[PDB]
A paper describes a structure:
Conjugative pili are widespread bacterial appendages that play important roles in horizontal gene transfer, in spread of antibiotic resistance genes, and as sites of phage attachment. The pilus is a polymer of the VirB2 protein (or [name]). The structures of the pED208 and F pilus are very similar, with overall dimensions of 87 Å in diameter and an internal lumen of 28 Å in diameter. Thus, selective binding of PG to pilins occurs in both F and pED208 pili, and thus, the F family of pili are polymers of a selective and stoichiometric protein-PG complex unit.
During the process of helical reconstruction, as the resolution was increased, an additional separate density became clearly visible and readily interpretable as a phospholipid. For the F pilus, it became apparent during the process of helical reconstruction that two populations of filaments were present, differing slightly in the rise between subunits (see below). Instead, two 5.0 Å resolution electron density maps were generated for the two F pilus populations. For pED208, the angle between adjacent subunits is 28.2° and the rise is 12.1 Å, while for the two F pilus structures, the helical parameters were 27.9° with a rise of 13.2 Å and 28.1° with a rise of 12.5 Å, respectively. Superposition of the structures of pED208 and F TraA reveals very similar overall structures (root-mean-squared deviation in Cα positions between pED208 and F [13.2 Å rise] of 1.4 Å and between pED208 and F [12.5 Å rise] of 1.5 Å) with slightly different boundaries for secondary structures. Also, the TraA [name] structures in the two F pilus forms are virtually identical (root-mean-squared deviation in Cα positions of 0.7 Å). Thus, with the structures and helical parameters of the two F pilus forms being so similar, functional differences between them are unlikely to arise but cannot be excluded. The amino acid sequences of both the orthologous pED208 and F pilus TraA [name] are similar, except for the F [name] N terminus, which is 4 amino acids (aa) longer. This longer N terminus could not be traced in the F pilus density maps and thus must be disordered. Indeed, the presence of phospholipid in the F pilus was also confirmed by MS; however, this time a PG species, PG 33:1 (16:0, ΔC17:0), was the major phospholipid observed in the F pilus after PLA2 treatment.
Numbering used by the authors:
A (entry chain 2E), B (entry chain 2F), C (entry chain 2D), D (entry chain 2C), E (entry chain 3F), F (entry chain 3E), ...: 6 to 70
């Protein structure tokens, strides 16, 4: 029949590829990496900056409801 | 005779390989891992991202009602 | 529907390309590098000085809500 | 809205192009270089003496709140 | 009809975006983070300082009675 | 109506920008950093010395009851 | 009203610009630096010797209850 | 009131300008330098021999309880 | 009228600023810290040594019956 | 009246400036430091050797029943 | 009265200036230093060889029960 | 009484001036120095060859149980 | 009988010699090595570039489901 | 008689030398090592790659039901 | 089946032979080498300038998704 | 799709054939060479003076975004 | 009378200076040290190899029922 | 009586001077040293190659059940 | 009895005097040395080229299972 947890899925809107929360993540990510680099002065922290984004993309693309 | 817990199995629809709940899981999984990585900056948390999915797949394939 | 974490986004104002915090970062960055150079006397630490800025720019441009 | 870290920015006064701290830096810089030269007797250490200053200037000019 | 728990909602006044309690929270938050940093000397604890505030804001904005 | 946790706010006097406790913090902060430097002999620990102060200032300015 | 942590401030006497503890610090500082130099034979460790003192002075002057 | 770490200051006697420990330092200092010179045959190591002494003197004179 | 738990307050004598128990506390405190330092060899445990004392003082001064 | 935990204070005799236990502490302290130095070959561990002693002294002098 | 940890002090015999354990220490100390020198070929490790001994002596002389 | 670590001292036999281990040391010492000289062709490595031996001798003579 | 984890093995497709993930690896590998070389200017980092590939190949060939 | 846990031993099929799961292991093993090497650039992680395999082999050969 | 990390591969666009990032690399490479040469005045640093490019080319050609 | 690091490329403006930084380089290059020649009085240091320029040119021409 | 835990003391036979278990210990000890050295290539792990043995000996000699 | 851990001692066969495991050790030892030398090009790693063997021998000879 | 790690020893085949891996080693060894010589132009790196081989031989001959 109907799976009862169905419907809704503003969950998607909530978490969607376009969503506040998503944008939140990389934001602080951008920060801390930039932060960390001051401390470290190593080239490390600029990756998931891009990577998590596409990482986000793929899993979002993977699941995407 | 008839096992009385039988019938129904919208349970399947509820939990099925295609189900809200399933999609829910990996979603937050994608999140927390991405979250964790900001904190950790270790390559760890991108696995069950894929793995749990196929892990889901196999057990779902294992049982599948 | 409406993703509930939406609205607000003074978060943007908070973290925006024009924001206090952003300006904070490079500031101390300028410092420590200048600091470090006294110790090191190597040409190293003048990069993210510029780079993080454009690094900031791109990610800000990448996400930008 | 209002980014909450805003206001204040005696931070600027604290770190500004005219600030104690800034003047502190080059001071010791002048020292150690002069110090180092006694040891080294190489022409090295008189640079950021001027350079960091303009380096300070540019980043200060770069960010400048 | 009338939901009996209704009325009142000095609860709001009690817990509102403007309320003592709210202000209480971030206060001690400011403290402990500043406290922690002495111990840790890591850049960690200055976040919910801002973040919880907007976190407060959003949930307050989310529910807001 | 009246939020019951209201009134009082000697809490402010207790924790205010001018308060014992506040002054307590930076004090020990000054100490441990000076302490740490003996051990480390790195330029690290003189920051929140100033920074926490303005950090205190801003959050105090942020909330300030 | 009265902030309860107030009064006392033999804390000041305890930690004051004139205090045992303060004098303790630079003392061992003088030692270890002199110690270190034997090992290192680098001109490094004679700084906070003076610097921490004025560093002490400023923060003491900064807070000073 | 009375700073509790006060009194005592056999600490002074312990570490004083006249103290065993002080005399200990320069002693081994004299040694290692003389030692080092055998290896190095450079004129380096005869400095803090005198210098640390006056260095000791000044900091001792600086703090001197 | 008369609060029945009143009178007595040898409780004070029992717990007073001058009391056995009070003196007991810091004693073992002195011990364990000294103990701990052997294990740790970190400068940590000498604080409440002084601090708890004044901490004791203030709360004692705070309440003091 | 009489604070009941009073009397006794063989506790003092037990823990006193002259006591077995006290002497016990520095003993093992002397050991482990000497031990550690074999491993480390750093000049670190000879401090509380003297310091804890006077540290003991002061707190003992601080409290001293 | 009598401090209960008193008596015994075969502890002394155990750890005394003449004791097995004491002799144990310098022994391995002699070894590792001699060991280390093979690796290092630096004049470092022959010190506490003598020094710890007198270091032992003094602390033993310091405490000596 | 009796220090419990006493007795035994086949430890001596184990490590004694006449012991396998002792002889082991200088052996490899002889080797590596001879080895090193091939590489270096400097007169360096023939010292503790003799020196460690007498170094061994003295410390052995120093402690010698 | 049938091993239940069997079937599936899109795992292979997932991780196969031809797979996204595989290609991902060497990619970043190419990067970081090229990155590192800028810093190091040593010939080091161009190996697993080729090597991991054949390393991948062999293990893939080793297991290959 | 018959040990009741007997029979079955599709467990073997499940875990056998030829089994999905087994192949799973080394797979990710191949990955992480290759992964790690990018980070480390040390020759470490290519061992159990082969070794665990034969390690698997032996224990499998050891037990093998 | 379908390897879930598949699709996407704007990763390619991201990192492709034609990509911003790629161009970024050699750029700074050109810089630092030119920089280094001022310091060194050795012919060293003009290699990966060309070499990394073809190095990039080959690995890109090697993997190229 | 769109490579996310794209756009921006004021990076070019930043580092372009016409850019401050570029002009900076050769400047100091001109200096140090002229400097060096005083010391050396060898004809060496006038090369990258021209050469780096065309070296700059070619790599700039090579990459040029 | 008779202490009831008495008798038995095959415990001795179990744990005695000659016992399986004892021999077990040093065995694995020999292993891991030899193991560790491969990893470390430091001279560390060959000690309790001998030492624990005599350590065993002494405690065994100490207690020995 | 009989120490219960007795008997067995295929443990010996397991770990004996002639045992697989033993031979395993030196094997990888031979490898890594040879490996290391490529990296280091120092004469270091050929020792326990022989030494551990006799080290094995002696401890094996020491315990040998 | 039977040492359980026994049997197998395709380990030998794996690592044997004739084995892939062995041949792998010297190969890259040949490379890097030839590589290094370009950089160094010293006669150094052609040794273990031959030496490791016989070094391999001896240890292989030493252990050889």
């Amino acid at each position: 029949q109907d799976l009862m947890a169905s419907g809704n899925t503003t969950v998607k809107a909530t978490f969607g590829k376009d969503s506040s929360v998503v944008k939140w993540v990389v934001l602080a990510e951008v920060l801390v990496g930039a932060v960390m680099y001051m401390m470290t002065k190593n080239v490390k922290f600029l990756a998931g900056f891009a990577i998590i984004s596409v990482f986000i993309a793929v899993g979002m693309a993977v699941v995407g409801l």
